[PDB]
A paper describes a structure:
The most frequent cause of familial forms of these diseases is a hexanucleotide repeat expansion in the non-coding region of the C9ORF72 gene that is translated into dipeptide repeat polymers. We demonstrate that proline/arginine repeat polymers inhibit the folding catalyst activity of PPIA, an abundant molecular chaperone and prolyl isomerase in the brain that is altered in amyotrophic lateral sclerosis. X-ray crystallography determines the atomic structure of a proline/arginine repeat polymer in complex with the prolyl isomerase and defines the molecular basis for the specificity of disease-associated proline/arginine polymer interactions.
The structure of the PR20/PPIA complex was resolved at 1.3 Å resolution. In the heterodimeric complex, four PR repeats are in direct contact with the catalytic pocket of the enzyme. The functionally important PPIA-residue Arg55 forms hydrogen bonds with the carbonyl group of a proline–arginine peptide bond. The proline residue in this specific peptide bond has a cis conformation, suggesting isomerase activity of PPIA on the PR repeat polymer. The chaperone-bound PR polymer chain displays a continuous electron density without interruption throughout the crystal lattice. Always four PR dipeptides from the polymer bind in an identical manner (residues I to I + 7 in Fig. 3b) to the respective PPIA molecule in each asymmetric unit.
Residue numbers in the entry:
A (entry chain B): 1 to 8
B (entry chain A): 2 to 164
Amino acid sequence: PRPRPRPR
Amino acid sequence: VNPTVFFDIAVDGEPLGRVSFELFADKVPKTAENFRALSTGEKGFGYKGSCFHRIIPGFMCQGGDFTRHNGTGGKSIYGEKFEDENFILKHTGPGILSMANAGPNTNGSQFFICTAKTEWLDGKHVVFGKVKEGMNIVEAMERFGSRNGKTSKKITIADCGQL
């Protein structure tokens, strides 16, 4: 699970 | 004239404050209309009573999952999903309102409010509005987020509609 939006 | 919508935010049921938004119907009319209609509940469903399930301080506050309350649900006024309308508008700074998605042409009801410039999201998420009043209330909501986005208190849209 890597929900968007993704951070930077 | 671009529409204005508001959300009244509560924390564990305690009123926190109101956030209003300008919706850029002049540039993204289809996407602005979905958000506007979900805010008014005019189609018989929408944001009222839904929660901000993912809050990452210094990045964004995410909500709009009114069906599953955890990032895996939501739906638009057009169907379960609709296309990325355009990427005219960019993620320029705090207050930008933009669509969350699960890849291209997967917009439903989930949205995020930036609390920083997030330019890496340009051309991947549809920008459709900004905060107009109550950015301080969005800033207060970050008090209940975490690096991984799990909230430490229940953050809800107690009321919403059009101004």
